[PDB]
PDB file of C-alpha atoms in Angstrom:
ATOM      1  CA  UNK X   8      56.100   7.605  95.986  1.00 26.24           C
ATOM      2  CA  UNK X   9      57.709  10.251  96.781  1.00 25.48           C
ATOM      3  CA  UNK X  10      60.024  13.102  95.038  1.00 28.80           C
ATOM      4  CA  UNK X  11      63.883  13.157  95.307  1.00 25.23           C
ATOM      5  CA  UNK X  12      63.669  17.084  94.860  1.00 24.74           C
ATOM      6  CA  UNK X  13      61.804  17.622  98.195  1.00 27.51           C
ATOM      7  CA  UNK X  14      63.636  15.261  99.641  1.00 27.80           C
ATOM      8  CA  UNK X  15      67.352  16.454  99.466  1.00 25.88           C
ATOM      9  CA  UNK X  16      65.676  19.732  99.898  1.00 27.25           C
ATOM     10  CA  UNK X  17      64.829  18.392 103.550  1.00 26.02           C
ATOM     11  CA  UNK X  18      68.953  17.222 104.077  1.00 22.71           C
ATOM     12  CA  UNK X  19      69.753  21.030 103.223  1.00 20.05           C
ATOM     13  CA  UNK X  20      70.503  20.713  99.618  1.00 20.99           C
ATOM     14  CA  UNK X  21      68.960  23.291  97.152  1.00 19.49           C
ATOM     15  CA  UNK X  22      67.759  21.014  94.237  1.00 17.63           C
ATOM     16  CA  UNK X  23      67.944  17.994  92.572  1.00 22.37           C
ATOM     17  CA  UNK X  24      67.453  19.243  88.624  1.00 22.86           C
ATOM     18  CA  UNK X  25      66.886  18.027  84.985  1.00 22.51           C
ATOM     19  CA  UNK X  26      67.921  19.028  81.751  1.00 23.18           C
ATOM     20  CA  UNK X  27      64.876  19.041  78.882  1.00 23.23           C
ATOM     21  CA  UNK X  28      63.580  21.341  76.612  1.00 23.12           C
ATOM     22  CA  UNK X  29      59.905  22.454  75.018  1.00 22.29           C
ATOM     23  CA  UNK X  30      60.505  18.888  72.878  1.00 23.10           C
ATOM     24  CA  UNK X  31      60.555  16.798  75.671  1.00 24.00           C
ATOM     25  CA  UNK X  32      57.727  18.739  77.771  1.00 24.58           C
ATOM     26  CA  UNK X  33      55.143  19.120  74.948  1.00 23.24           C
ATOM     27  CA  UNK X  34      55.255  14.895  74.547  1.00 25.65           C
ATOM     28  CA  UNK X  35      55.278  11.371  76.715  1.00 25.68           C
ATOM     29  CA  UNK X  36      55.241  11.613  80.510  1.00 24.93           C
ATOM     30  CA  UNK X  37      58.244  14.265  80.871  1.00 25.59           C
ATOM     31  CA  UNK X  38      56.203  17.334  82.218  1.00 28.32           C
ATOM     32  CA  UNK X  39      54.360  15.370  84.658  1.00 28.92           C
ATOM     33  CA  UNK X  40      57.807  13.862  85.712  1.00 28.25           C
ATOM     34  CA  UNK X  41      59.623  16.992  86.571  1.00 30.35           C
ATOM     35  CA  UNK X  42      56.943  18.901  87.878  1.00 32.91           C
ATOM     36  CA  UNK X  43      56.077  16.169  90.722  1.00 30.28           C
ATOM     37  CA  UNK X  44      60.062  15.046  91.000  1.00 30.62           C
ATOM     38  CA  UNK X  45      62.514  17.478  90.141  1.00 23.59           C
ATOM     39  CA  UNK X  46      63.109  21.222  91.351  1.00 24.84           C
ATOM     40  CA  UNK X  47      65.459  22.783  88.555  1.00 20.46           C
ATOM     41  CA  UNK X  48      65.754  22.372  85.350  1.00 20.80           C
ATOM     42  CA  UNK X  49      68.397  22.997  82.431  1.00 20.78           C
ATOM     43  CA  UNK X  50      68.045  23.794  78.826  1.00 24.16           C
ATOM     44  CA  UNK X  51      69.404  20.385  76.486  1.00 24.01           C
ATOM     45  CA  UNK X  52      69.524  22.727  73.084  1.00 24.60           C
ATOM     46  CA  UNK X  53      67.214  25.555  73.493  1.00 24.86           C
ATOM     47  CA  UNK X  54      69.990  28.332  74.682  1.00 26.17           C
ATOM     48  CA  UNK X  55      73.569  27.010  73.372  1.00 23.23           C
ATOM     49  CA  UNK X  56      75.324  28.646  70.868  1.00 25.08           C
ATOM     50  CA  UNK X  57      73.977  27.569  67.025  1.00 23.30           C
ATOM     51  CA  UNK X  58      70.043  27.941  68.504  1.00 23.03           C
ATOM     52  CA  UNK X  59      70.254  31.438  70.031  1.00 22.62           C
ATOM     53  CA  UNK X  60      72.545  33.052  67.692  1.00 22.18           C
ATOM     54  CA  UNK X  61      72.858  31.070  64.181  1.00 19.19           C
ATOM     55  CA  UNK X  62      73.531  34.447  62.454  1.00 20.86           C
ATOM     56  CA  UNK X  63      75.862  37.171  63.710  1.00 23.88           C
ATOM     57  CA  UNK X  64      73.843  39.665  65.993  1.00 24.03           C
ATOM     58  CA  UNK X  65      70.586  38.036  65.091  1.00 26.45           C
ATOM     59  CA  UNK X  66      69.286  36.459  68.285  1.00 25.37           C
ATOM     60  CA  UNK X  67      65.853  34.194  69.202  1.00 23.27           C
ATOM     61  CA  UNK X  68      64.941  32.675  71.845  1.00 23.12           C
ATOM     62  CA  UNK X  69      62.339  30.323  70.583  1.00 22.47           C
ATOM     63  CA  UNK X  70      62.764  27.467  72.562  1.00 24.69           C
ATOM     64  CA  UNK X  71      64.707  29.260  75.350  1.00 23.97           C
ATOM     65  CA  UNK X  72      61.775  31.310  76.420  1.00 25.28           C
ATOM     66  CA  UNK X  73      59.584  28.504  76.273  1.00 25.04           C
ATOM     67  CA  UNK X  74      61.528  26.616  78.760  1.00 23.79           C
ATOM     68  CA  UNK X  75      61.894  29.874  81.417  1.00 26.18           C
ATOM     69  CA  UNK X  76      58.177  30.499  80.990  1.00 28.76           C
ATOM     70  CA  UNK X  77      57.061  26.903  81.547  1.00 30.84           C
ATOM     71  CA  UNK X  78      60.034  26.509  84.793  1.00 31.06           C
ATOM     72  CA  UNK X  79      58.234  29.494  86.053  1.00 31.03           C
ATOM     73  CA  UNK X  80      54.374  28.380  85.932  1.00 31.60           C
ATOM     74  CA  UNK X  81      55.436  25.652  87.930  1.00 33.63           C
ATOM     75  CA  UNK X  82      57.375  26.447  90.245  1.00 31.53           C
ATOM     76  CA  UNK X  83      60.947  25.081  89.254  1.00 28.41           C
ATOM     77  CA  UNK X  84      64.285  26.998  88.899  1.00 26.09           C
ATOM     78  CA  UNK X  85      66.212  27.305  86.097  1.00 25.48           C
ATOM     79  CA  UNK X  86      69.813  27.059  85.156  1.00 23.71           C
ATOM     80  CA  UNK X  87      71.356  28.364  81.297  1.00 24.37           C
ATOM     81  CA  UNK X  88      74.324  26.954  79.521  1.00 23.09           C
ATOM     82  CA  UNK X  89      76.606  26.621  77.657  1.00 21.53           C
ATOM     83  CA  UNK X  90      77.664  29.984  76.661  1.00 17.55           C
ATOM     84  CA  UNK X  91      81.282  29.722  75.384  1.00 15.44           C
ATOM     85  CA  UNK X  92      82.465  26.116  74.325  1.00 13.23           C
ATOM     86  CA  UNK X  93      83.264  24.497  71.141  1.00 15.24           C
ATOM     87  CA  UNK X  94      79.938  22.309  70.998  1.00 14.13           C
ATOM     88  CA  UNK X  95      77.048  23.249  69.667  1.00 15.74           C
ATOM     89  CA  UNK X  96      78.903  26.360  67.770  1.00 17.13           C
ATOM     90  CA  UNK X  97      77.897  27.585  64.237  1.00 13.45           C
ATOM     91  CA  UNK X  98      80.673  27.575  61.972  1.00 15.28           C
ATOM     92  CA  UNK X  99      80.678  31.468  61.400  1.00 16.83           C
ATOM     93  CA  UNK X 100      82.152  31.692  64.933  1.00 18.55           C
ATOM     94  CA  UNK X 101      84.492  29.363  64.621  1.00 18.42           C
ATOM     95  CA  UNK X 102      85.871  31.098  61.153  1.00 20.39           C
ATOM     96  CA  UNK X 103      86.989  34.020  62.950  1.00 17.99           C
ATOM     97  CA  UNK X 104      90.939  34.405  62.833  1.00 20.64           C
ATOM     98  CA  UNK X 105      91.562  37.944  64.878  1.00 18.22           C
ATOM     99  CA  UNK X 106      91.342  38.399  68.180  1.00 15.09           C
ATOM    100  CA  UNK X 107      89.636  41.285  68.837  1.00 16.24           C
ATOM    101  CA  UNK X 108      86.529  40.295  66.357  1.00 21.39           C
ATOM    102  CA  UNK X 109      85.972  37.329  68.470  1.00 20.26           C
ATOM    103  CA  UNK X 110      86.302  38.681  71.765  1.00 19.99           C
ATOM    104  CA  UNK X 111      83.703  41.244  70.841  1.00 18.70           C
ATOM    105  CA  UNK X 112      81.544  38.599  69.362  1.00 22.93           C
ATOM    106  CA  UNK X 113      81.958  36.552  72.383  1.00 21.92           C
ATOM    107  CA  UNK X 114      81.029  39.478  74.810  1.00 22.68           C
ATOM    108  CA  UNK X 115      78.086  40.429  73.098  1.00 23.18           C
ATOM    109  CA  UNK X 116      76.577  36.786  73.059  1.00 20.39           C
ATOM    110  CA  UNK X 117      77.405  36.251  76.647  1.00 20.94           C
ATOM    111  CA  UNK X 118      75.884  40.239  77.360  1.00 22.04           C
ATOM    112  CA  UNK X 119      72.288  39.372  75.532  1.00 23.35           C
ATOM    113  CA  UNK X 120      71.551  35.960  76.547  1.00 21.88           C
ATOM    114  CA  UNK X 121      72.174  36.699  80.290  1.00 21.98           C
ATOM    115  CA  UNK X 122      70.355  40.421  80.050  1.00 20.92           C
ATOM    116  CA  UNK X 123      67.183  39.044  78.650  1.00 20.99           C
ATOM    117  CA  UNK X 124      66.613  36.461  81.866  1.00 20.46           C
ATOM    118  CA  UNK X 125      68.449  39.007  83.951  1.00 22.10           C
ATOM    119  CA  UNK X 126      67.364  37.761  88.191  1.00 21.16           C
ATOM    120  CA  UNK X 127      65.681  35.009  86.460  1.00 19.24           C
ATOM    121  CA  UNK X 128      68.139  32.595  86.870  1.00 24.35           C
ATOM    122  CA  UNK X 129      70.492  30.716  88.942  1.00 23.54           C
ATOM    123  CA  UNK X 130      73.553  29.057  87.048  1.00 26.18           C
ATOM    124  CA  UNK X 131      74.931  30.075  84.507  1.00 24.22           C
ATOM    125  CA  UNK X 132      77.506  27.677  82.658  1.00 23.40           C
ATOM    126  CA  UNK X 133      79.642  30.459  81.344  1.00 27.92           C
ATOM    127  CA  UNK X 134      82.526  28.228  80.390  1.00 27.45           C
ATOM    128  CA  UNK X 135      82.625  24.363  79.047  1.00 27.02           C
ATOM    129  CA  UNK X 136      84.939  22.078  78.205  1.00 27.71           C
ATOM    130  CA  UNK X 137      87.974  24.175  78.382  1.00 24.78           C
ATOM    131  CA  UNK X 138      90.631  21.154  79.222  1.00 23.98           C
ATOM    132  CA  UNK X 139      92.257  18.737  77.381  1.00 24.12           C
ATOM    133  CA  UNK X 140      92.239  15.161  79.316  1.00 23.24           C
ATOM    134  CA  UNK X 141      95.966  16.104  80.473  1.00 24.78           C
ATOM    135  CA  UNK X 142      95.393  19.139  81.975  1.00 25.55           C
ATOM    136  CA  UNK X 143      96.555  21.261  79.484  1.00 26.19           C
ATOM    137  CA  UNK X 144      93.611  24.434  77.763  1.00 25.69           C
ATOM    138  CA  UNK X 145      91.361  22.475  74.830  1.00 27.29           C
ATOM    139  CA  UNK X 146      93.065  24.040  71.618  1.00 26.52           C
ATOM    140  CA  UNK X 147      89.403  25.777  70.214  1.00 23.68           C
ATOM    141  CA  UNK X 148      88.856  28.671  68.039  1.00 25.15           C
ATOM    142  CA  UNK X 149      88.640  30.995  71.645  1.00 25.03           C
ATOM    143  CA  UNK X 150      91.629  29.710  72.956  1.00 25.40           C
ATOM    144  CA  UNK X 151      93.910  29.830  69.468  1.00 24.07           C
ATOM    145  CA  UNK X 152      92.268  33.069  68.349  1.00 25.86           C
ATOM    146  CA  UNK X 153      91.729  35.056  71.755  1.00 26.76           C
ATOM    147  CA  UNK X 154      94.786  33.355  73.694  1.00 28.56           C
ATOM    148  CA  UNK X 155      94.184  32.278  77.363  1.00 31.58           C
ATOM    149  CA  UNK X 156      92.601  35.581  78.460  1.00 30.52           C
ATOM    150  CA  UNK X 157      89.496  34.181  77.009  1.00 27.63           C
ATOM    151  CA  UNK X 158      87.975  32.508  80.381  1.00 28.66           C
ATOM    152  CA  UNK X 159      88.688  35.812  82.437  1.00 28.68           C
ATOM    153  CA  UNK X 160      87.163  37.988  79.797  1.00 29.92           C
ATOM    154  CA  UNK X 161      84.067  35.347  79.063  1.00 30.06           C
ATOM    155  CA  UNK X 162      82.922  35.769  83.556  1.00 29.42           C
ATOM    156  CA  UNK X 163      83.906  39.161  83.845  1.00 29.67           C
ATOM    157  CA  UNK X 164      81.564  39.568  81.048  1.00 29.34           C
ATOM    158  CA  UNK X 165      78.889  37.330  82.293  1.00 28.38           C
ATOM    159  CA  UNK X 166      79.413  38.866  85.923  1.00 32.85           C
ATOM    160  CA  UNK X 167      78.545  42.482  84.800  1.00 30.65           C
ATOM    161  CA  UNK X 168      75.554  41.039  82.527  1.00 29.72           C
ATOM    162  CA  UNK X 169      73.675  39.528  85.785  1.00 30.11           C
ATOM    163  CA  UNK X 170      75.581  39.448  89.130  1.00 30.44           C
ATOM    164  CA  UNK X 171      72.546  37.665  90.925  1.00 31.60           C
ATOM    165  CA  UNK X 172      74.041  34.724  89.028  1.00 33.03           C
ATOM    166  CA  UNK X 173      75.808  31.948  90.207  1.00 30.72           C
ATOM    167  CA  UNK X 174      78.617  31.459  87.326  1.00 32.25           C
ATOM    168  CA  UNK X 175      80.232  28.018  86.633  1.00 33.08           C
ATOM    169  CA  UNK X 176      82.693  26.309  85.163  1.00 34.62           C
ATOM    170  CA  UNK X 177      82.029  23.150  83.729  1.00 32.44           C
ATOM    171  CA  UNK X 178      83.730  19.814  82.021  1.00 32.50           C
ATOM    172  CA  UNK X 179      83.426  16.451  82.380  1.00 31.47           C
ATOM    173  CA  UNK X 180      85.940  13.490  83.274  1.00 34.13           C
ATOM    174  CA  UNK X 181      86.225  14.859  86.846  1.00 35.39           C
ATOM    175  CA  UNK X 182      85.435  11.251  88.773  1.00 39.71           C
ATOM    176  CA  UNK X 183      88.420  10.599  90.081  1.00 40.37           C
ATOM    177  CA  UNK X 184      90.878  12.450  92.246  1.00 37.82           C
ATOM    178  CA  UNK X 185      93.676  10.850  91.242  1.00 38.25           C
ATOM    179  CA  UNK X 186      92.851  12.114  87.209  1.00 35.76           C
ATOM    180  CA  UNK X 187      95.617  14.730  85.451  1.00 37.42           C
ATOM    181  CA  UNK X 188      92.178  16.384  84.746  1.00 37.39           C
ATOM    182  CA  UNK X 189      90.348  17.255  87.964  1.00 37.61           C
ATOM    183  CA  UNK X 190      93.878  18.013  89.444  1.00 37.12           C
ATOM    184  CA  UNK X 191      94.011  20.802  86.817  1.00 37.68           C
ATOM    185  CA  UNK X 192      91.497  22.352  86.982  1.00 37.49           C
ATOM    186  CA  UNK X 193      91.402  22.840  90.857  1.00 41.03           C
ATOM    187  CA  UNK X 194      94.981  24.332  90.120  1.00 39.80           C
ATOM    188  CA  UNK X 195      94.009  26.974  87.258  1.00 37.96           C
ATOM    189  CA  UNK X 196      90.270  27.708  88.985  1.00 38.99           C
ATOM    190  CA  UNK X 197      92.609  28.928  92.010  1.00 36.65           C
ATOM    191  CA  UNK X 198      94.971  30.898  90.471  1.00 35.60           C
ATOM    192  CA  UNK X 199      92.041  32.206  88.063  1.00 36.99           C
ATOM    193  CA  UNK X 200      90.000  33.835  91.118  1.00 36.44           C
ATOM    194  CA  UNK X 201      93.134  34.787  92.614  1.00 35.26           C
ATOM    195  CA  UNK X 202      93.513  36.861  89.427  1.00 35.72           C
ATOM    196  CA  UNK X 203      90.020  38.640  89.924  1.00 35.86           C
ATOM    197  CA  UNK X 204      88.252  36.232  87.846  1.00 38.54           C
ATOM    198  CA  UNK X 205      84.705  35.744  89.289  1.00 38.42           C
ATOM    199  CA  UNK X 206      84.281  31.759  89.380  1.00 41.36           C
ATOM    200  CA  UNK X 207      81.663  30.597  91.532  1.00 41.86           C
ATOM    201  CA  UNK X 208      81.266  27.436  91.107  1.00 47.57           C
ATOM    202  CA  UNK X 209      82.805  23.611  88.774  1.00 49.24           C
ATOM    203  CA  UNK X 210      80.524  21.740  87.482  1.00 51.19           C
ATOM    204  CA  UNK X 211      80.862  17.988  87.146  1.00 52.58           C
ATOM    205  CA  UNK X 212      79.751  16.558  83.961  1.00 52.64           C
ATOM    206  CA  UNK X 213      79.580  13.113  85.675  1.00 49.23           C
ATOM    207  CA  UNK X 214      79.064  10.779  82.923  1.00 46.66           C
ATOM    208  CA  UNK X 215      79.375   7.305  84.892  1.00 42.99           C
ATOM    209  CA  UNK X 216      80.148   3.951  83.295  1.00 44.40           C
ATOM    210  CA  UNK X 217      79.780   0.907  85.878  1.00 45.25           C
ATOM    211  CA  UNK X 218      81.586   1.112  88.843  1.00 42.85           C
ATOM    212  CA  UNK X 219      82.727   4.607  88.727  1.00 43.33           C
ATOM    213  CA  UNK X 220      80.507   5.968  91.364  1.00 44.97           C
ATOM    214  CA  UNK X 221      82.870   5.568  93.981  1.00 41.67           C
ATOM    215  CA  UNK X 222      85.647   7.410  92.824  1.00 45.83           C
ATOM    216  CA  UNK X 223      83.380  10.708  93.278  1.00 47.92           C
ATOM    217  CA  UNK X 224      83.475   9.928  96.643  1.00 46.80           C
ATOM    218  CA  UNK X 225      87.093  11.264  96.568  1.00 46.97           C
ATOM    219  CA  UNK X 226      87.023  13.832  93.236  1.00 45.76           C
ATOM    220  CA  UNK X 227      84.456  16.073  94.696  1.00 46.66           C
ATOM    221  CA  UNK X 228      85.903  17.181  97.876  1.00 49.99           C
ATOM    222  CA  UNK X 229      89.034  17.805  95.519  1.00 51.06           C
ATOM    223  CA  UNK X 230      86.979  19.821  93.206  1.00 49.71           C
ATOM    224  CA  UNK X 231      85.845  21.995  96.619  1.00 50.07           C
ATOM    225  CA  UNK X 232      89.517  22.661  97.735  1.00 50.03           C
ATOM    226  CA  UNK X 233      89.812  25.256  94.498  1.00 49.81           C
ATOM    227  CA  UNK X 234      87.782  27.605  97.158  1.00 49.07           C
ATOM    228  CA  UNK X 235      84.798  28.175  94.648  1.00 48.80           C
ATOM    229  CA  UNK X 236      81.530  29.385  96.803  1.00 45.28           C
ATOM    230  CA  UNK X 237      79.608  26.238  94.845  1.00 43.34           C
ATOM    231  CA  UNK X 238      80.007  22.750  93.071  1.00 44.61           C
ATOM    232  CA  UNK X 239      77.655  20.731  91.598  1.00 44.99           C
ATOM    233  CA  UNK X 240      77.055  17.254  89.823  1.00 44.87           C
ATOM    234  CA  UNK X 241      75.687  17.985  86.426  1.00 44.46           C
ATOM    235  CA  UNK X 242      74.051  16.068  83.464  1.00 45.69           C
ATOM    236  CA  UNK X 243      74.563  12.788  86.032  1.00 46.72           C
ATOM    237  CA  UNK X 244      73.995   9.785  83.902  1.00 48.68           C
ATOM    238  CA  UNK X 245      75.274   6.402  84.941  1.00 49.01           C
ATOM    239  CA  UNK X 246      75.634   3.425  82.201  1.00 48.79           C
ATOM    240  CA  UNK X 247      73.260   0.369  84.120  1.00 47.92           C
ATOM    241  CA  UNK X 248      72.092   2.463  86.192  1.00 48.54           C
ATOM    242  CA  UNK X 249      73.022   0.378  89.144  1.00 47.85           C
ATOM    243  CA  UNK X 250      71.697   1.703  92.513  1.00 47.98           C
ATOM    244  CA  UNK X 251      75.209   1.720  94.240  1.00 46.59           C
ATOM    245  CA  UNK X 252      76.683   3.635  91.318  1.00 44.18           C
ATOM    246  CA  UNK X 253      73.772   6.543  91.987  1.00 44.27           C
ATOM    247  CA  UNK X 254      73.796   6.554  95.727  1.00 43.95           C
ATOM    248  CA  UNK X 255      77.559   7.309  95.530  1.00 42.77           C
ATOM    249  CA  UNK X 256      76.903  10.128  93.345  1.00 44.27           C
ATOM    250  CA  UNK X 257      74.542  11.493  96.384  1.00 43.87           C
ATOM    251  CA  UNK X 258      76.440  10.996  99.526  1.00 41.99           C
ATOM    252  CA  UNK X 259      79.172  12.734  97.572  1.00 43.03           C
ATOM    253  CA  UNK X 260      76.970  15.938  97.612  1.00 42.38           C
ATOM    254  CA  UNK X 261      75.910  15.397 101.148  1.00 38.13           C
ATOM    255  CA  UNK X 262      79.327  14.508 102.268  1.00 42.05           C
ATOM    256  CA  UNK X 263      80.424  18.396 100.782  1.00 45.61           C
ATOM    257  CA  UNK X 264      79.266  21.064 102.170  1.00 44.59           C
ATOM    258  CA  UNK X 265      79.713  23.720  99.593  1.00 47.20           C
ATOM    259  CA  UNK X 266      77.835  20.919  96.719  1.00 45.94           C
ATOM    260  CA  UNK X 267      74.424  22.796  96.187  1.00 49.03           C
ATOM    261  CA  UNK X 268      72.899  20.251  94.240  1.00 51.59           C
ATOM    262  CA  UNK X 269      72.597  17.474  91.471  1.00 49.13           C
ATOM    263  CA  UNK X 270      71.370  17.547  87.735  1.00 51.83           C
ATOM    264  CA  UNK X 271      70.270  14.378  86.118  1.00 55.05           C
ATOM    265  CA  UNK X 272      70.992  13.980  81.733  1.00 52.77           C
ATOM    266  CA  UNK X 273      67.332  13.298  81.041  1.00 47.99           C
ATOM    267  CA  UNK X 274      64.226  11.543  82.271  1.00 48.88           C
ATOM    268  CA  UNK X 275      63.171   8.304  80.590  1.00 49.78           C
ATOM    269  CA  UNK X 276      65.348   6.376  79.313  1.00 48.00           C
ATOM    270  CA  UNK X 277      64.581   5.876  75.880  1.00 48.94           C
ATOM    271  CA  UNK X 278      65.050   9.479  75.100  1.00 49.49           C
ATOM    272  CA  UNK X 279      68.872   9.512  76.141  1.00 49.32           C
ATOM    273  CA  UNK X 280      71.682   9.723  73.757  1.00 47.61           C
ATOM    274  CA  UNK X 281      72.807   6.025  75.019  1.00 46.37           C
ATOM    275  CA  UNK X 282      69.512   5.026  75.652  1.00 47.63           C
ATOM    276  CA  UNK X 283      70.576   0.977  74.819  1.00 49.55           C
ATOM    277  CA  UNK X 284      73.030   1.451  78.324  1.00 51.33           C
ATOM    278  CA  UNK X 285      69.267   2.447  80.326  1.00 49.63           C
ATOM    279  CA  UNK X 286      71.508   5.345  82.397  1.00 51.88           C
ATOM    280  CA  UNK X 287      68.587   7.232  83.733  1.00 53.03           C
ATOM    281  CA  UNK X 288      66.375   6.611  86.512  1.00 55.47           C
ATOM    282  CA  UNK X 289      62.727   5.912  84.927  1.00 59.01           C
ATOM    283  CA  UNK X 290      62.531   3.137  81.955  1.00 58.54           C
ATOM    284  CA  UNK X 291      60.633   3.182  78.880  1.00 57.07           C
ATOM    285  CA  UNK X 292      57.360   3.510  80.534  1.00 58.88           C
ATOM    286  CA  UNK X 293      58.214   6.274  82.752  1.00 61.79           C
ATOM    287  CA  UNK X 294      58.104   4.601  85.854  1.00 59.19           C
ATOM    288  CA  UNK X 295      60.216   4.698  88.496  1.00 60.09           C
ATOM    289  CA  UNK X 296      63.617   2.261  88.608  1.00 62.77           C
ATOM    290  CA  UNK X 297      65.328   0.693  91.465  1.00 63.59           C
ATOM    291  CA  UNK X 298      68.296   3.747  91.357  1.00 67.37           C
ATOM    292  CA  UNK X 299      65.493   5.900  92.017  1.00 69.99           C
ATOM    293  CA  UNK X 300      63.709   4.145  94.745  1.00 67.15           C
ATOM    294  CA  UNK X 301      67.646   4.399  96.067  1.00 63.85           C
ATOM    295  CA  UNK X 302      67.987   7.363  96.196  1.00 64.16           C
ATOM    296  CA  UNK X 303      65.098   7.728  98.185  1.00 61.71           C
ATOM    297  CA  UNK X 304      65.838   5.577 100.588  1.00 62.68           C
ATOM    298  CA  UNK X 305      69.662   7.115 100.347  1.00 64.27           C
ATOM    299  CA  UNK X 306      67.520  10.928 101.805  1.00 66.16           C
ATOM    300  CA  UNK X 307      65.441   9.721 103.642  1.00 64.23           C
ATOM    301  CA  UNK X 308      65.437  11.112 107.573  1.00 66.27           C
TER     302      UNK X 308
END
């Protein structure tokens, strides 16, 4: 009917994105999906760690380039991630014990992946995952090896590769504002840029189970008040998939002026990690569902 991307475009919003990769685009319904529906999209596997370098300073870019190339013959934007978290890792890296071996490894994986796409494109997830659910730093290899310094060192790094891109922060558990977790991180992401480090934006890994749409309604404006030119909802999945818990999620955005935009996990929902919950917003035969139609109505003039 009509597409979700043009039409949070029209209420001043950038995009409304979606993560896949040449797997999903080269089978089913998904191509034909995104390009009618969605405006940005984000790379499941193709660029983390293990599939760009499984080898130390042997890069490819199989499935990375054929994600950029197909965003660009169609007119969609693209957004690269995650560059320095403790998913997705090969075990080499995380066998490193001294700090400056890592550091330099980390620098130099953050430096290619960025140059090769250089103006290409728009987020960048430099850092994910970084916080334990009590606020405290995650305890992985960067952080015990490297110390805290790793964060400013990983977006100074990532700022000199491409400064035309917008560099974020992500993690997920960040739905309510009364969580140890999303107070945290609004505490250290202020005292981080107040230290020179160039944050531009937190990224929400809102992974929803019923009910928990409305406690966004509070934890985004908190995320905003670290002073970060940009937030964002990302990989937005909601178990049910109940329209209420979805149209929170987008008057959120509109109700914050400095949220850019929204990233859905997936398309269909068969092809989801927790595909039995139905979290997406098109069912097994890639038609619309009533969260969808939703948000339509939910943007509409």
């Amino acid at each position: 009917a009509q597409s979700i991307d043009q039409l949070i475009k029209a209420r001043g919003k950038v995009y409304f994105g979606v993560a896949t990769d040449q797997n999903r685009l080269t089978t089913g319904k998904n191509a034909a999906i995104i390009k009618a529906d969605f405006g940005m999209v984000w790379p499941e596997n193709s660029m983390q760690w293990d599939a760009t370098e499984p080898s130390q300073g042997n890069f490819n870019f199989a499935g990375a380039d054929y994600l950029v190339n197909w965003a660009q013959q169609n007119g969609k934007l693209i957004g690269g991630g995650c560059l320095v978290w403790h998913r997705h890792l090969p075990s080499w890296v995380s066998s490193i014990t001294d700090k400056n071996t890592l550091t330099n490894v980390m620098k130099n994986h953050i430096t290619t992946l960025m140059t090769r796409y250089k103006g290409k494109i728009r987020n960048w997830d430099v850092v994910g995952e970084a916080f334990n659910e009590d606020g405290s730093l995650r305890q992985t290899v960067f952080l015990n090896v490297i110390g805290e310094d790793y964060i400013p060192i990983a977006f100074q790094t990532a700022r000199a590769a491409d400064p035309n891109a917008k560099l974020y922060i992500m993690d997920y558990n960040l739905d309510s504002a009364s969580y140890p977790k999303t107070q945290a991180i609004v505490n250290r992401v202020k005292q981080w840029r107040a230290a020179g480090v160039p944050i531009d934006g937190i990224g929400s890994q809102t992974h929803l189970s019923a009910g928990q749409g409305a406690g966004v309604l509070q934890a985004l404006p908190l995320l905003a008040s670290a002073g970060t030119p940009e937030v964002s909802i990302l990989m937005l999945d909601v178990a049910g998939a109940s329209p209420t818990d979805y149209v929170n999620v987008v008057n959120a955005c509109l109700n914050v002026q400095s949220c850019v935009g929204i990233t859905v996990f997936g398309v269909a929902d068969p092809d989801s990690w927790r595909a039995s919950t139905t979290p997406l917003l098109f069912d097994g035969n890639f038609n619309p569902k009533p969260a969808y139609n939703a948000i339509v109505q939910d943007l509409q003039q």
